[PDB]
Amino acid sequence: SPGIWQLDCTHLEGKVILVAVHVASGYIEAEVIPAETGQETAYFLLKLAGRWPVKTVHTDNGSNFTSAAVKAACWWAGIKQMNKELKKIIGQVRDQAEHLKTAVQMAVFIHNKKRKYSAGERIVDIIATDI
Amino acid sequence: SPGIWQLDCTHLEGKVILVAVHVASGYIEAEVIPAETGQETAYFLLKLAGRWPVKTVHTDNGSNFTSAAVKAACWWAGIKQMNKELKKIIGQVRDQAEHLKTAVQMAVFIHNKKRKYSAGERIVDIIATDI
Ligand SMILES: Cc1sc(-c2ccncc2)c(C2=CCC(C)(C)CC2)c1[C@H](OC(C)(C)C)C(=O)O
Ligand SMILES: Cc1sc(-c2ccncc2)c(C2=CCC(C)(C)CC2)c1[C@H](OC(C)(C)C)C(=O)O
């Protein structure tokens, strides 16, 4: 179902990576964040929701969505309630970039553009059809 | 044509807002950035390119794309070379949020979800068709 996303944080090099997966396509968005925090999560959701038709969000750690900041973002945006593969791609391009956040975005790109239709194409095809 | 984006910076409250417009749809992405810098622009493009099939980018200030960081990001991602309306929406929601970056993302959401088909729907429809 096309409005369903998964959201979790991983850790790498002492930093936090917020990973969102569009469950039906495998498409990912990610951001390096300073702190694993309610407010960072809330902001990330605001951004994600302005870009895609987000209806529901799941996570493997329910306490992620406990802050009032997160619930207020879900309320306003109308939202209700891969990490090893991405680390794999991060490891392969890690040498090419100084900043982890750069390596993360290179890895997101590679992941979404890989054909093995790509994830980036499936998300768009699934969403257009549903309209 | 569907791989064409426009990219510029505006200023608000002493901060920098990087605004990307998908020319064929009116769809926008935006980010508040600390500094109007080559490296911020480069990073923004990396992110944008991992999410949408970006072919070409235009800007109203050509010197924006002069840094080696920007050219290296365009090279790696395979890329070649609204602000008053968004400020309008920012002004309307500005009171609801503490941080400008939050007001910016609320305004991007509103702009992409408005029907007056919405911009968010047109981008997806235009891209799916082209595949
Ligand atoms: C801090 C720098 S300098 C620099 C650069 C400058 C000139 N030529 C090549 C790379 C780069 C790039 C490396 C990989 C890239 C393909 C994303 C493009 C730009 C970066 C890069 O940071 C950016 C993306 C500019 C914030 C990095 O973390 O190393
Ligand atoms: C720094 C805070 S606290 C807070 C909040 C907390 C509890 N209830 C309502 C709003 C909010 C929210 C305001 C508007 C919103 C619709 C995006 C949702 C979350 C914020 C918000 O910053 C975030 C989005 C958390 C980084 C802000 O700039 O004011």
Ligand SMILES: [Mg+2]
């Ligand atoms: Mg988690």
Ligand SMILES: [Mg+2]
């Ligand atoms: Mg400009």
